[PDB]
């Protein structure tokens, strides 16, 4: 019924728009993400950008033409995607929901395992280990139940640098197994050796799935990870898509 690939594929059309893409990663996160308002947020824009006396000394000034598109960081694309997939008539404001709602890394793989296929969730994940976040979409399904990872990385961490749209592009779309994640999000990943630490964080995290692009002398060894998992509509994710669309 909803096509959940295109879903992805509308996503990265918003963001390669001009204005599309200051829709999608305003950072209000108290208000729903479709009662966002295109004049509202390129007015915000101009009248900051007079008050410094125009384009040129603004840039001068601030080092960046705020007209640019934005290249989110790891929790601007993670939080806003799962606005798109939370909200329906009412917001979600997942840096409250994060603190409020979380359980840890082992709580959620006790969860997982008793999810109602009929059903679909979304994990919004901070791992303080990479200090990275990212999003684990769970859709109902009536074969396997596996997860899809969306996120974008400024790759100050373990990690590579990594564009929003590159990644949603293809490893956006690929699943991985519960399983996998399981042991990924696990206070028992420590216990690996670190060539196994670099395949599982490489297969699921990295564009190329290689080895070598995973920095374990960046991971900070002793922390957990927090995790607020949520039951979602797809509904309402097709047409929080429709929205955004609709207001260009």
């Given at each position: 019924?909803?096509?959940?690939?295109?879903?992805?594929?509308?996503?990265?059309?918003?963001?390669?728009?001009?204005?599309?893409?200051?829709?999608?990663?305003?950072?209000?996160?108290?208000?729903?993400?479709?009662?966002?308002?295109?004049?509202?947020?390129?007015?915000?824009?101009?009248?900051?950008?007079?008050?410094?006396?125009?384009?040129?000394?603004?840039?001068?000034?601030?080092?960046?033409?705020?007209?640019?598109?934005?290249?989110?960081?790891?929790?601007?694309?993670?939080?806003?995607?799962?606005?798109?997939?939370?909200?329906?008539?009412?917001?979600?404001?997942?840096?409250?929901?994060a603190q409020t709602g979380k359980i840890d890394g082992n709580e959620?793989?006790?969860?997982?395992?008793q999810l109602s296929s009929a059903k679909n969730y979304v994990a919004?994940?901070?791992?303080?280990?990479?200090?990275?976040?990212?999003?684990?979409?769970?859709?109902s399904n009536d074969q396997e139940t596996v997860g899809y990872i969306?996120?974008?990385?400024?790759?100050?961490?373990?990690?590579?640098?990594?564009?929003?749209?590159?990644?949603?592009?293809?490893?956006?779309?690929?699943?991985?197994?519960?399983?996998?994640?399981?042991?990924?999000?696990?206070?028992?990943?420590?216990?690996?050796?670190?060539?196994?630490?670099?395949?599982?964080?490489?297969?699921?995290?990295?564009?190329?799935?290689?080895?070598?692009?995973?920095?374990?002398?960046?991971?900070?060894?002793?922390?957990?990870?927090?995790?607020?998992?949520?039951?979602?509509?797809?509904?309402?994710?097709?047409?929080?898509?429709?929205?955004?669309?609709?207001?260009?």
């Amino acid at each position: 019924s909803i096509n959940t690939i295109k879903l992805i594929d509308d996503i990265i059309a918003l963001h390669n728009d001009p204005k599309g893409n200051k829709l999608l990663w305003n950072d209000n996160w108290q208000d729903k993400i479709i009662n966002r308002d295109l004049a509202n947020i390129f007015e915000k824009i101009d009248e900051s950008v007079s008050e410094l006396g125009g384009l040129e000394m603004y840039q001068e000034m601030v080092g960046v033409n705020p007209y640019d598109p934005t290249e989110p960081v790891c929790g601007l694309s993670a939080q806003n995607i799962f606005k798109l997939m939370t909200e329906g008539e009412h917001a979600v404001d997942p840096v409250e929901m994060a603190q409020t709602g979380k359980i840890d890394g082992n709580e959620f793989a006790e969860s997982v395992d008793q999810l109602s296929s009929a059903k679909n969730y979304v994990a919004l994940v901070n791992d303080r280990r990479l200090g990275h976040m990212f999003l684990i979409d769970i859709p109902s399904n009536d074969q396997e139940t596996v997860g899809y990872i969306y996120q974008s990385d400024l790759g100050q961490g373990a990690l590579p640098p990594l564009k929003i749209a590159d990644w949603l592009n293809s490893r956006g779309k690929d699943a991985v197994s519960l399983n996998k994640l399981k042991k990924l999000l696990s206070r028992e990943f420590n216990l690996l050796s670190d060539d196994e630490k670099r395949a599982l964080i490489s297969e699921t995290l990295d564009i190329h799935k290689d080895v070598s692009n995973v920095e374990l002398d960046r991971i900070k060894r002793d922390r957990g990870v927090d995790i607020y998992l949520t039951e979602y509509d797809v509904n309402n994710f097709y047409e929080n898509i429709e929205t955004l669309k609709s207001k260009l």
